[PDB]
Amino acid sequence: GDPMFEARLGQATILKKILDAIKDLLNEATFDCSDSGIQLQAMDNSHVSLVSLTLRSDGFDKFRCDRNLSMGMNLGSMAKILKCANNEDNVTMKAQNADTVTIMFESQEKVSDYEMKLMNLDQEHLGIPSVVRMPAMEFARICRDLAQFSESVVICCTKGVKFSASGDVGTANIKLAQTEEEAVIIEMQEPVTLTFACRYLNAFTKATPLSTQVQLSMCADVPLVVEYAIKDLGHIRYYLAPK
Amino acid sequence: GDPMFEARLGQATILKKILDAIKDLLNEATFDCSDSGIQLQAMDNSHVSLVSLTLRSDGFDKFRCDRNLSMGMNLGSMAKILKCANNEDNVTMKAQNADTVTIMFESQEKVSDYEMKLMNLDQEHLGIPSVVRMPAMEFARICRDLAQFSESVVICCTKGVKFSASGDVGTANIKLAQTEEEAVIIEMQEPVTLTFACRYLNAFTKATPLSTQVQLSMCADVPLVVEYAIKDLGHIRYYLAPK
Amino acid sequence: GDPMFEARLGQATILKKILDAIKDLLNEATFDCSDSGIQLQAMDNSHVSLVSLTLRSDGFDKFRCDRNLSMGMNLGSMAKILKCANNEDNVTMKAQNADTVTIMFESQEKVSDYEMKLMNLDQEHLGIPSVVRMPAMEFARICRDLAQFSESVVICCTKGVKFSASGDVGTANIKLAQTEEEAVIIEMQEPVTLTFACRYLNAFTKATPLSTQVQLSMCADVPLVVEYAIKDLGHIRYYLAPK
């Protein structure tokens, strides 16, 4: 007919994990689809952090976008649909204009199609705002652990990075020297020390299954950026202002 | 003395799984013991579905039943006893007449005997009421998934079977083509489509560990029968009227 | 400077498991440190059972204790610190006098130090009060299972040991004949039968990960002693009076 969006990923789990990385920060968001792929930018529910997702067209098995379109979606509903996909299902999203989007899983003997209504969301009015590379699971463990001591974590980087927290339980200091991964790589001129809200760092680490290395961009006075590479596809970035 | 019931199964886990398959639908039921084995027929707690269990005498390692007897049992208490059995324990049920039944696990160095009071339940006054064979775990997954969308699931069979649900979250369609298992086998003359209450199908799937294939008998206007083969022993069947 | 306590264990998990074994019985306790190692004796929160821990100096990779000292500690806070240790971290405890103690984990690229305030607890005023050796996991399973039937468990030992409980659910008897482990070894002159509170035995079995064999010392009229060997280091003992 005329005109359509259709994007096919080889593995549904990639999309399931992308949704896990944002669903607890955003109950709804808009996916902007264009020739170059899919992007999302939104303030979290509490309007503190900024979430920015980039998926490139060249990482899809099939990508067609006849005209630019934006799909406002309930992320909770989208998560429930992605829960229905098996381990080696692909996932196709199609939007006829739209009032709905369709999500399709295929493997073989099983074909599943799901149809979800589209919103209807306002444009966000946003501004998107140096670095240390280290294991994603180590960053996640450190943030989980230090949260036991305090709602704030001090990050102090030289060229090693130190994560600190203190409170009733006691005072904690975790020091990682510069060395699937265990490599800790640091790029710094002037040392930086900043304090961040643990509850937000811990939300960011829901992106952990997407990447074995995480990137922290931390200059003084300006938001930290936490970045997870999505293999052969793009990345998610979280922006968080220091205290 | 005179006279006794004694039935011995090689693996207690078989009985643990049988109890898992009925305990959440029936808080109490009567086991009718005779020369041909053990049977159970009962309406569920809400008096909607019918549960019918058949165990043949020739599947027990030892089966003795001097006279017919019926044992009214608290299934919750029986479940707690079976929780006490290890992986390669056998299980012997003995009833002297009934006032009690005894349940015994043996392996070796460990012998456990449990004694439970018998009821005292009324006879049920029941009437027991074409088919598609498919993986039990697939049926269970499909029913769990579709329950996210609705309290009702439409089952539409041709010769593939389609499971559908729609609601606020969206609309879902799952289509399985005719092909430990993955085989989907269909026996139909006239196509049938019926709608069932998800909460009941999901209770039936507690029988899943007993069988890798499940059987659905579905003619128009009459109750669906969901059947799990219990290896070298018998079967459990659940009966559910369509909407 | 002058003078210090410093004790280093090769594996932090040993200490994590020691804490698991006492934290639910004691919210705070005093560790008495001397030349011969570390000891702890305390009544539980309900003031029913007695917990007694012995760690020998010769089981530490490094042990220095310039003068005797006692460290009153919040066990819940100490547990939270030990949660921060990884699988092959060592653990060093240091006390300068304290007012605080420091706990340090090292592996390599990661160094963590934690600092916790010391109490300030009264001396306990205590008196420390035949035997059967058997698998720790079997003892734990038996106690968990029998708790379904009753708040009391009868232990009846000859030369096999029998564990019994009865109640609404039914009556239970578990008999272990004398034979990583499965060995059941019995040392008795006169047979003994005693009844114990299940909720306490079940608290004791939190020590299970420390030892594959457990020891029960049970003479008539006097407290049972339940003992778990801590490999190449010492033991924990729980004392419980019969009903």
Swiss-Prot record, chains A, B, C:
Does rRNA processing show up as a keyword for this record?
no
> What's in the keyword line of the UniProt record?
Chromosome, Cytoplasm, DNA replication, DNA-binding, Nucleus
Pfam families, A to Z? PCNA_C (PF02747), PCNA_N (PF00705)
Task: Quote the disruption phenotype from the UniProt entry.
Answer: Mutant flies show temperature-sensitive lethality, hypersensitivity to DNA-damaging agents such as ionizing radiation and methyl methanesulfonate, suppression of position-effect variegation and female sterility.
Single GO biological process annotation from the record: response to UV
Extract the DNA-binding region annotation as residue ranges: 64-83
- An example Gene Ontology CC term for this record: cytoplasm
Tissue-specific expression: Expressed at high levels in adult ovary.
**Membrane-spanning parts:** none
Where's it mainly located?
A: nucleus
What's an example of a GO molecular-function annotation for this chain?
Answer: DNA polymerase processivity factor activity
Compartments it resides in: Nucleus; Chromosome; Cytoplasm
Which family is this sequence assigned to?
Answer: Belongs to the PCNA family.
Q: What does this protein do?
A: Likely to be an auxiliary protein of DNA polymerase delta complex and is probably involved in the control of DNA replication and repair by increasing the polymerase's processibility.
Which NCBIfam families does the record associate with it?
Answer: pcna (TIGR00590)
Q: Whom does it interact with, and what assembly results?
A: Homotrimer. Forms a complex with activator 1 heteropentamer in the presence of ATP. Interacts with E2f. Interacts with the catalytic subunits of two DNA polymerase complexes: PolD1 from the delta complex and PolE1/DNApol-epsilon255 from the epsilon complex.
Q: What is this protein called?
A: Proliferating cell nuclear antigen
**Name of the coding gene:** PCNA
